[PDB]
């Protein structure tokens, strides 16, 4: 869980420094939010990781 949070955070940082259209950045931020949610409580929102 910590590795997924670190990976998606680093990818979001790279995407913001690169400059991308809004679809990619919004998808990456949604994945970051769901990673933090799965870290704090797996299986709360929909299917568990």
């Amino acid at each position: 869980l910590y590795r997924r949070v670190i990976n998606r955070n680093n990818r979001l940082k790279r995407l913001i420094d690169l400059g991308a259209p809004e679809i990619i950045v919004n998808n990456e931020k949604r994945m970051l939010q769901e990673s933090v949610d799965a870290l704090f409580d797996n299986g709360r929102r929909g299917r568990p990781v």
């Binding site: 590795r3 670190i6 990976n7 680093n10």
Partner: protein, 50 residues
């Protein structure tokens, strides 16, 4: 507050933690998804075991 905890207690107050207290407990920002070296079995720099 008490960080040594020598057996004298009166209260255990819970509370909602903020970003300042979170970055004030910490001893450094972990910034790599690495755990251990695959060959020499030592913790990596800036990893989850650093």
């Amino acid at each position: 507050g008490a960080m040594l905890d020598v057996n004298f207690f009166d209260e255990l107050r819970i509370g909602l933690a903020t970003a300042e207290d979170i970055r004030q407990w910490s001893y450094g920002e972990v910034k790599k998804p690495e755990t251990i070296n695959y060959r020499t079995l030592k913790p990596e720099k800036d990893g989850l075991f650093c």
